[PDB]
Design a binder for this molecule. Structure first.
Ligand SMILES: CC(C)CCC[C@@H](C)[C@H]1CC[C@H]2[C@@H]3CC=C4C[C@@H](O)CC[C@]4(C)[C@H]3CC[C@]12C
Ligand SMILES: CC(C)CCC[C@@H](C)[C@H]1CC[C@H]2[C@@H]3CC=C4C[C@@H](O)CC[C@]4(C)[C@H]3CC[C@]12C
Ligand SMILES: CC(C)CCC[C@@H](C)[C@H]1CC[C@H]2[C@@H]3CC=C4C[C@@H](O)CC[C@]4(C)[C@H]3CC[C@]12C
Ligand SMILES: COc1ccc(N2CCOCC2)c2sc(NC(=O)N3CCC(C)(O)CC3)nc12
Ligand SMILES: CCCCCCCC/C=C/CCCCCCCC(=O)OC[C@H](O)CO
Ligand SMILES: CCCCCCCC/C=C\CCCCCCCC(=O)OC[C@H](O)CO
Ligand SMILES: CCCCCCCC/C=C\CCCCCCCC(=O)OC[C@H](O)CO
Ligand SMILES: CCCCCCCC/C=C\CCCCCCCC(=O)OC[C@H](O)CO
Ligand SMILES: CCCCCCCC/C=C\CCCCCCCC(=O)OC[C@H](O)CO
Ligand SMILES: CCCCCCCC/C=C\CCCCCCCC(=O)OC[C@H](O)CO
Ligand SMILES: CCCCCCCC/C=C\CCCCCCCC(=O)OC[C@H](O)CO
Ligand SMILES: CCCCCCCC/C=C\CCCCCCCC(=O)OC[C@H](O)CO
Ligand SMILES: CCCCCCCC/C=C\CCCCCCCC(=O)O
Ligand SMILES: CCCCCCCC/C=C\CCCCCCCC(=O)O
Ligand SMILES: CCCCCCCC/C=C\CCCCCCCC(=O)O
Ligand SMILES: CCCCCCCC/C=C\CCCCCCCC(=O)O
Ligand SMILES: CCCCCCCC/C=C\CCCCCCCC(=O)O
Ligand SMILES: CCCCCCCC/C=C\CCCCCCCC(=O)O
Ligand SMILES: CCCCCCCC/C=C\CCCCCCCC(=O)O
Ligand code: NA
Length: 385
C-alpha cells in the first residue's frame, strides 16, 4: 500500500490553506464591525459571534483535525476533547444563524417596537448563553456518553500506546448514536428546519406587506376614477368614506396625509348637502396632493421593504451554505449508523467531506462583501489603509 504520509500531505495542506482563509476573512468581519459604527447593530453582533466561531475553527479546530489524522496515542478524554471541540463551534454557529433569522423576522413583522424589543445589551447576553450551551451540547461525550469504557486495546497496542492511552480516532471515541440522534437530528437538523420556517414567514410577511401597500394605492386611484361619474348625488359619499379609511390604513403603516385626509373630508361635507357637482370639483384636489406627497411615501416604503428582503435573502444564503457544507458529513454518519452492512465511505471522500465542512468558515466574509454595500466599502478602506 502507498505511504499514508503522501496522501496526508494533500489533506494537511488543503486544511492549512482553509485555516489561513478562515482567520483572515473573519478577522476582517470583526474589524469592520469594530470600526464602522453603521455596522454596529444587534444583527451584526451575531455576525461577529459567527465569525468568532469561524476564527476558532482555523485557530484550533483545523489543527485538531490534522492531529487526529495521524492517529496519535493519547488518553481517551483528552482525545475526546480534540474530536469534539469542533461540535462546540458548529453548535455555536447554529445558534447564531437562528438568532439572525429571528432578528430579521422581528424587524419585518413588528418594526414599530423593534427598537424597544431587540436591545444591544440583551443580544450580548443571548450570545453568551448560546456559547455556554454550545460547550454543553458539543462536549456532551465528555460527560459520559462516549466509548472510553470499551477501548480498542488491540489498536492501542498495535501502535504502542502507553497505559491508559488509546489510538485517537473520532469514530473510536465518539458513539455514532450521539452523532446521529443527539448532534445531527436534535441539535442541527431541527434548528435548521426551524430556521427554514422563520425565513418562510419573513418572505411571506414581506410579500404580503408589498401587496398590502399597493392595494391602498389601487383603492386610492380606483375610487378617484369613480367619483367623477356618479349617478346618485351622494354616490361619491361611498367612494369618499372608503378613501378616508384607505388613507388612514396606509398612514398607520409608516404632513402630506393631513393635507390628503383634510381634502377628503372637504369633499365629504359637500356630499352631506347633496351638492354633487361641487364635491366632484373638490375631489380632484386629491390628484395634486397624491402626486407630490403620497406617491413618494409609496415609493419610499416599497424601497425600504425591498432592502429588508434583500438583507433577509443575504442571511438566508449564509444558513443555506452552512447546511450544504455540513450535511455530507452528517449523512455519512447516518449510513455508518443505520446500515452496518453497507460499504463505509472511503478515506478520500471522508477528507473531502471534512474539508467541505471547514470551507463554510471561509464563505461568510465573501457573502457580506458581495451582498452588503456597507460591509464592502469598509473592507476596502481597511485594506487601502
Ligand atoms: C488558549 C488555547 C490555545 C488553549 C488550547 C488548549 C488545548 C490545545 C489543550 C487543552 C486540553 C489539551 C488536551 C488534554 C489531554 C490530552 C491527553 C494527552 O495524552 C494528549 C494531549 C491531550 C489531547 C491534550 C491536547 C491539547 C489540549 C486539547
Ligand atoms: C432536509 C434533509 C436534508 C434532511 C436530512 C435527510 C437525512 C436525515 C436522510 C436523507 C437520506 C437518508 C439515508 C438514505 C439511505 C440510508 C440507507 C439505509 O440502509 C439506512 C438509512 C439511511 C442511512 C438514510 C438515513 C437518513 C438520511 C441520511
Ligand atoms: C447534500 C448535498 C450537498 C449532496 C452532498 C453529497 C453527499 C450527501 C453524497 C455524495 C456521495 C455520497 C456517498 C457515496 C458513497 C457512499 C458509500 C455507501 O456505502 C454509503 C453512502 C455513501 C457514504 C454516500 C453518502 C452520501 C454522499 C456523501
Ligand atoms: C458532522 O460529524 C462530524 C463532525 C466532525 C468530525 N471531525 C472531528 C474532528 O476531526 C475531523 C473530523 C467528524 S468525523 C465523522 N465520522 C467518522 O469519522 N466516521 C468513521 C468513518 C465512517 C465512514 O464510518 C463514517 C463515520 N463525523 C464527523
Ligand atoms: C460575549 C462573549 C461571551 C463569551 C462566553 C464564553 C463562555 C464559554 C464557557 C463555557 C463553559 C461551559 C462548559 C459546560 C460543559 C463543560 C464540560 C467539560 O468541559 O468537562 C471536561 C472534563 O474535565 C473532562 O474530564
Ligand atoms: C478553548 C477555548 C475556547 C473559548 C471559546 C470562547 C468563545 C466565546 C466568545 C467569543 C465570541 C464573542 C462574540 C462577541 C460578539 C459581539 C458582542 O457581543 O457585542 C455586544 C455589544 O458590545 C453590546 O453593546
Ligand atoms: C479563548 C478564545 C477566546 C475567543 C477569541 C477568538 C475570537 C474572538 C473574535 C472576536 C473579536 C472581538 C470582536 C468584537 C466586536 O467586533 O464587537 C464590536 C462591538 O460590537 C462594538 O460595539
Ligand atoms: C493564538 C494561539 C493559538 C494556539 C494554537 C494551538 C494549536 C494546538 C493544536 C494542536 C495541538 C495538539 C496537542 C496534542 C498533540 C501532541 C500529543 C502527543 O504528541 O502525544 C504523545 C503520546 O502521548 C505519546 O505517548
Ligand atoms: C509546517 C507543517 C506543519 C504540520 C505538521 C504536520 C504533522 C504531521 C506530519 C505528517 C505525519 O506525521 O503523518 C503520519 C501519518 O499520516 C499517520 O498515518
Ligand atoms: C448549562 C449547561 C452548562 C453545564 C453545567 C455544568 C456541567 C459540569 C460538567 C462536568 O462537571 O464534567 C465533569 C467530567 O464529566 C468529569 O470527567
Ligand atoms: C428532524 C427530525 C426527524 C427525526 C425522525 C426520527 C426517526 C427515528 C427512526 C429510528 O430511530 O429508528 C431506529 C431503528 O430501530 C434503527 O436503529
Ligand atoms: C426527517 C428525516 C428523518 C430521517 C430518519 C431516518 C431513519 C432511518 C432508519 O430508521 O433506518 C432503520 C435501519 O435501516 C434498520 O435496519
Ligand atoms: C477534489 C477537489 C476538492 C478540493 C479539495 C481537495 C482536497 C483534498 C484532500 C483530501 C484528499 C487527499 C488525497 C488523499 C487520498 C487518500 O486518503 O488516500
Ligand atoms: C486570533 C484572534 C484575533 C482576533 C482579532 C480581532 C480584532 C478586532 C477587534 C479588536 C479590538 C481592537 C483593539 C485595538 C483598537 C485600536 C483602535 O481603536 O484603533
Ligand atoms: C472574546 C470576547 C470579545 C468581546 C468583545 C466585546 C467588545 C464590546 C465593546 O468593545 O463595546
Ligand atoms: C495563530 C495560531 C496558529 C496556530 C497554528 C498551529 C499549527 C498546528 C499544525 C499542525 C500541528 C500538528 C501536530 C502533529 C500531530 C501529531 C504528530 C504525532 O505526535 O505523531
Ligand atoms: C446557562 C448559561 C447561563 C449564562 C448566564 C450568563 C449571563 C447572562 C445574563 C444576561 C442575559 C440577558 O441579558 O439576556
Ligand atoms: C445540556 C442540555 C441543555 C440544558 C438546558 C438547561 C440550561 C439552559 C436553560 C435555561 C437558561 C435560560 C437563560 C436565562 C438567563 C436569565 C437572564 C436574566 O438574568 O435576566
Ligand atoms: C439541503 C439544503 C441545501 C439548500 C440550499 C443551500 C444553497 C444555498 C442557498 C440557499 C438559500 C437561498 C434562499 O433562501 O434564498
Ligand atoms: Na463554522
Amino acid at each position: 500500500g502507498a505511504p499514508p504520509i503522501m496522501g496526508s500531505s494533500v489533506y494537511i495542506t488543503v486544511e492549512l490553506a482553509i485555516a489561513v482563509l478562515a482567520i483572515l476573512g473573519n478577522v476582517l468581519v470583526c474589524w469592520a464591525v469594530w470600526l464602522n459604527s453603521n455596522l454596529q447593530n444587534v444583527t451584526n453582533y451575531f455576525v461577529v459571534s459567527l465569525a468568532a466561531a469561524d476564527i476558532l475553527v482555523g485557530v484550533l479546530a483545523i489543527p485538531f483535525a490534522i492531529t487526529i489524522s495521524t492517529g496519535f496515542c493519547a488518553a481517551c478524554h483528552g482525545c475526546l476533547f480534540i474530536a469534539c471541540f469542533v461540535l462546540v463551534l458548529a453548535q455555536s454557529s447554529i445558534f447564531s444563524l437562528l438568532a439572525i433569522a429571528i432578528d430579521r423576522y422581528i424587524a419585518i413583522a413588528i418594526p414599530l417596537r423593534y427598537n424597544g424589543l431587540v436591545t444591544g445589551t440583551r443580544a450580548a447576553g443571548i450570545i453568551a448563553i448560546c456559547w455556554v450551551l454550545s460547550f454543553a451540547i458539543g462536549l456532551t461525550p465528555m460527560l459520559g456518553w462516549n466509548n472510553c469504557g470499551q477501548p480498542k486495546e488491540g489498536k492501542a497496542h498495535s501502535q504502542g500506546c502507553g497505559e491508559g492511552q488509546v489510538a485517537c480516532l473520532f469514530e473510536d471515541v465518539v458513539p455514532m448514536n450521539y452523532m446521529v440522534y443527539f448532534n445531527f437530528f436534535a441539535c442541527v437538523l431541527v434548528p435548521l428546519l426551524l430556521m427554514l420556517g422563520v425565513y418562510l414567514r419573513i418572505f411571506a410577511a414581506a410579500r404580503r406587506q408589498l401587496a398590502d401597500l399597493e392595494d391602498n394605492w389601487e383603492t386610492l386611484n380606483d375610487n378617484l376614477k369613480v367619483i367623477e361619474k356618479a349617478d346618485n348625488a351622494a354616490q361619491v359619499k361611498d367612494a369618499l368614506t372608503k378613501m378616508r379609511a384607505a388613507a388612514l390604513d396606509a398612514q398607520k403603516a409608516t404632513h402630506g396625509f393631513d393635507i390628503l385626509v383634510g381634502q377628503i373630508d372637504d369633499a365629504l361635507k359637500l356630499a352631506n348637502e347633496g351638492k354633487v357637482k361641487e364635491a366632484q370639483a373638490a375631489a380632484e384636489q386629491l390628484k395634486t396632493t397624491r402626486n407630490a406627497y403620497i406617491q413618494k411615501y409609496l415609493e419610499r416604503a416599497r424601497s425600504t421593504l425591498q432592502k429588508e428582503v434583500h438583507a433577509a435573502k443575504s442571511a438566508a444564503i449564509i444558513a443555506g451554505l452552512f447546511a450544504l457544507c455540513w450535511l455530507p458529513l452528517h449523512i455519512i454518519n447516518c449510513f455508518t449508523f443505520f446500515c452496518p452492512d453497507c460499504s463505509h465511505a472511503p478515506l478520500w471522500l471522508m477528507y473531502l467531506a471534512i474539508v467541505l465542512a471547514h470551507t463554510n468558515s471561509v464563505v461568510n466574509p465573501f457573502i457580506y462583501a458581495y451582498r452588503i454595500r456597507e460591509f464592502r466599502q469598509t473592507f476596502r478602506k481597511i485594506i487601502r489603509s
